[PDB]
Amino acid sequence: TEFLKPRLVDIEQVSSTHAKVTLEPLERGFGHTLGNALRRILLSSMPGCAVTEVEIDGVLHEYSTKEGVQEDILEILLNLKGLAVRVQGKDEVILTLNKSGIGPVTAADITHDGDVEIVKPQHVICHLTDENASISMRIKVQRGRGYVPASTRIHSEEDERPIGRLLVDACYSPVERIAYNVEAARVEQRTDLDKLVIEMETNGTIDPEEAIRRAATILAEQLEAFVDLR
Amino acid sequence: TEFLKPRLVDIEQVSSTHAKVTLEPLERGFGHTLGNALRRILLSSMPGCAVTEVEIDGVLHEYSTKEGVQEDILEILLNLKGLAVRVQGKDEVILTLNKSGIGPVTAADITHDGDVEIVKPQHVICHLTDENASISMRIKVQRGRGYVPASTRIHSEEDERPIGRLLVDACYSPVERIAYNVEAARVEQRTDLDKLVIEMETNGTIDPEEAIRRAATILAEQLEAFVD
Amino acid sequence: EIKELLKLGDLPTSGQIRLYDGRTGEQFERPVTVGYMYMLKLNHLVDDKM
Amino acid sequence: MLNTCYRILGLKPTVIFADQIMYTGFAYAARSGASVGIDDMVIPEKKHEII
Amino acid sequence: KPLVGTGMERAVAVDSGVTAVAKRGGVVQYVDASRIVIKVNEDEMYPGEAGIDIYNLTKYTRSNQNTCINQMPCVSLGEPVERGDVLADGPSTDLGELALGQNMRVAFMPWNGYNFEDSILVSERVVQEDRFTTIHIQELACVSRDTKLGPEEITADIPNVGEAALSKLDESGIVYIGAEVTGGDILVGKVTPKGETQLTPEEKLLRAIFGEKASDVKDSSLRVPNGVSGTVIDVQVFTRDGVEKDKRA
Amino acid sequence: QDVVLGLYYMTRDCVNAKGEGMVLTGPKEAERLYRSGLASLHARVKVRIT
Amino acid sequence: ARVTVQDAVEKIGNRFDLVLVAARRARQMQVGGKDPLVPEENDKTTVIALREIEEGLINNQILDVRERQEQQEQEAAEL
């Protein structure tokens, strides 16, 4: 056993969404071993927060039309799925949005909770055309992982059935795109030994370094069973 | 987080060299994550011992022909690649093989070292046809892990390469073949789960179960850099 | 004209790219034709047909 | 191959053999990454000559 | 839109009549999901009237194949518009161009025989984006007729019913607009007269055991078809001239 | 369809390729050098088969 | 017996008389409640009947022997 462990070298954060992470030195073949196994956990298993429920006033269903609003309610729900939200303390927060007058309703119009950060405040949700028009809604953000559709969520719970509650497809996973590469390491005299560049392209909330840390933790927790129980 | 860990169920150990392993219930999408990631480490990165060098007397190179011997020297080297060896203490041992008369030269003809076990003694290495004929060789077994061929060694090592030293492909990782399958796991509510089912193929020096255990240990050692 | 347009986007003449298996991570043995085809969902849906 | 196998071995072996052929056949087809491009349709240089 | 069109897309979308087009060019005075009001330029505007065109856009409505028809405004608040431009996009159109489906990254290669005979392997991401998700508006009618024995009622008062079924109905016996429903659930409570039917002794026992004996009026309520399930987007009531009107009506 | 094409691609040989004229212990060591990435499926090789 | 019914056919001969024999034995375990000879191994009465034919336990002639044994024993208790 010539155990040679890699170490986190450099995190080239080009943007808050897109960041490269270089990794060296890796012994031959471990570059692709961790590369893919991590990519899989980073795609599907990464916990995140996502808009689960919405409840707009003057709205009985998502297919209706609201006066003084360019977008149909479905297109508003779409914008709320891609609303970047980070809940710090609790798993479930129900934010309130009341806004009026002529203006594109941005994410900053939502009343921020003590422990809730709206990561992109300039994110568009709805367009108010008429000055007389006012919009009011209650946006529930819950935490989960992966992607939970509204068609899978309308066939499980349904204990309380309040008429006026629109469910939304949850985009819980924060990682949008991920693709690991391999480059020259140029260490001491290892030569063969190289590195592993993990390029991540995420939303706002989950931080590149933090996310890779969590993904390696999930893989190590699955490996407990193969180390401990034989 | 609804973390659902699998646990080792039944280890169908058909032989000491072939054993089946059933895993359940694993979380959906982790069926092929660990199955392949392990397959890779078990193929190329596993440690074990293998014939690296041989040196037969009356032989200047591997292409020559020795009188009173059925197999060409290349076909003898092939038999030494598949010679199962376990070195207990040292990482490098040079075994001596001298034998004569009419007989299939088996692995038991090699002089066993204080700390060297030849695992299949009935393993054929060469056939002596003539009784007057006698074979002598010096077989170097080194340790490593995974599979290092002679092509990936002549390219890397450009150090001592003298004429007559016969280079043989080393099969150190005791694992000969390894395959993982996943179909579909049915549970209570989850129906998109999977049950990893790999059929690792070893030689006998290392236990199938042990090999898996080491490969998961190497993977956890890499996770030490990622803190959690 | 299509190959000329592919060079404007810094894409191959061939319109075939080296893809990699999502499951394993290793490459497929050859370049695979990839691109954007406008597809259509027909009315023959299985919820009605079953 | 399956006609040979049917007459030598029997029914059981052919059913398993036919399956195993199917499995490995699909798998290695996918490995190959065989594809269809416009350059794969080679026209002979001497077509306009023949016409 | 299609990335690889022919150019006939815009001819087809516009001539089909499904897209709301500008009769006269000018500046858009008022924009809304429901309607578009455009003020016309003096040169094309007629001297008599005010010269403000109104386009009340046809909204999420049923088709003959029970599919969706919606007109979305494709011009912004107070935008200068030329005559004969597309003010609002149809169900299968985008900025005037015809949009029958969606374009996507396709790789031609075999895959474990999951694309065996024209079998298609699609990513979860396409299903996740709900881009190939289709709307199916569905029309089910509840009719009170006149049988020999008497006229049929439409009330929430229905024999043999759990509170789960009557929960989404209102006082009149009609489901609320917006209420999600699944196969079995009653949409409109309809009850029909029945003669005093010969109850078999076993049935007469069981009705005398619980006490709830079947009334003169039986049951024929409109309920959601077996397996189908959606959200109620509208209810329309047609009462004959002289017959009792429900409070919902 | 794919099944024929796959066994066809497997069996068919090619000039040298990766690892030509090698010598293997069994059909399992052939899968070992292919999955290890040291030999193409089309390499001419001597193999011991029973 | 599970997938392949060739070994059961090789023991009787006719594919048709096999279905008739297997059904006769299936109906004994279904109604009469006879105990199976091969371990059940959690299979349906149909598969047990094939398994027993495959091994050479159930047969048209053997079933007539065992039917005559149960029948005539009761006929002897009468007479």
Domains and CATH numbers, chain G: 1-79 (3.90.940.10)
Extents of the domains making up chain A:
1-47+173-230, 48-172
Of A2, A217, A229, the CB nearest to B8: A229
CATH tag, A1-47+173-230: 3.30.1360.10
- Experimental technique, in short, is X-ray
The alpha-carbon gap from C15 to the nearest alpha carbon of chain D, in Å, equals 7
Instruction: Please report, to the nearest 10 degrees, the dihedral formed by the alpha carbons of residues A77, A81, A84, A90 taken in order.
Output: 100
Tell me the C-alpha distance between A141 and A148, whole Å: 13
Q: For residue E52, give the nearest of E22, E82, E72 by alpha carbon.
A: E22
Judging contacts by C-beta atoms under 8 Å, the chain C residues touching residue D35 are 16, 30-33
| Structural contact between residues E172 and E166, judged by C-beta atoms closer than 8 angstroms | no
β-strand pairing of F45-47 with F22-24: parallel
What is the residue whose two structure tokens read 């279904």? G30
Q: For residue B31, give the nearest of B207, B155, B143, B184 by alpha carbon.
A: B184
Q: Do B176 and F32 touch (CB under 8 A)?
A: yes
| Structural contact between residues G36 and G27, judged by C-beta atoms closer than 8 angstroms | no
The alpha-carbon gap from C4 to the nearest alpha carbon of chain A, in Å, equals 28
Judging contacts by C-beta atoms under 8 Å, the chain C residues touching residue E1 are none
Q: Do E110 and D30 touch (CB under 8 A)?
A: yes
Q: For residue A65, give the nearest of E1, G25, E234 by alpha carbon.
A: E234
Residue A107 is which amino acid? A
Tell me the C-alpha distance between E124 and F37, whole Å: 31
| Structural contact between residues A126 and A108, judged by C-beta atoms closer than 8 angstroms | no
Tell me the C-alpha distance between A200 and A39, whole Å: 9
Tell me the C-alpha distance between A100 and G17, whole Å: 84
Q: Do A67 and E232 touch (CB under 8 A)?
A: no
End-to-end CA distance of chain C: 46
CATH tag, B1-47+173-228: 3.30.1360.10
Beta bridge partners of B118: B85
Resolution in A: 3.5
Evaluate the omega torsion of the peptide bond into residue A6 and state whether it is cis, within 30 degrees of 0: no
Tell me the C-alpha distance between F10 and B105, whole Å: 36
Tell me the C-alpha distance between G64 and G54, whole Å: 18
In 3-state terms, what secondary structure has residue A172? coil
Pick left, alpha or beta for residue E79 (phi over 0 → left; psi -120 to 50 → alpha; otherwise beta): beta
Contacts of E46 (CB under 8 A, 6+ apart): none
| Structural contact between residues E78 and A131, judged by C-beta atoms closer than 8 angstroms | no
Residue G19, Cβ density class (10 Å: 0-12 exposed, 13-18 middle, ≥19 buried): middle
Q: Do E112 and D36 touch (CB under 8 A)?
A: no
Q: Work out the angle between the directed axes of helices A30-44 and A208-227 (0-180°, nearest 10).
A: 110
Of D30, D32, D37, the CB nearest to C16: D37
Judging contacts by C-beta atoms under 8 Å, the chain A residues touching residue C24 are 36
Evaluate the omega torsion of the peptide bond into residue B6 and state whether it is cis, within 30 degrees of 0: no
Beta bridge partners of C29: none
| Structural contact between residues E96 and E14, judged by C-beta atoms closer than 8 angstroms | yes
Based on C-alpha coordinates, what's the Rg of chain F? Answer: 11
Tell me the C-alpha distance between C25 and A38, whole Å: 11
The alpha-carbon gap from A179 to the nearest alpha carbon of chain E, in Å, equals 16
Search chain G and give the residue with CA nearest D10: G6
| Structural contact between residues E213 and E159, judged by C-beta atoms closer than 8 angstroms | no
| Structural contact between residues F7 and D24, judged by C-beta atoms closer than 8 angstroms | yes
> For domain B48-172, is the CATH number 2.170.120.12?
yes
Tell me the C-alpha distance between A207 and A203, whole Å: 9
Q: For residue A227, give the nearest of B57, B79, B6, D30 by alpha carbon.
A: B6
Q: Do B223 and A216 touch (CB under 8 A)?
A: yes
Tell me the C-alpha distance between A102 and E30, whole Å: 12
Q: What is the DSSP string of A81-121?
A: HT--EEESS-SEEEEEEEEESSEEEEGGGS---TTEEES-T
Beta bridge partners of B160: none
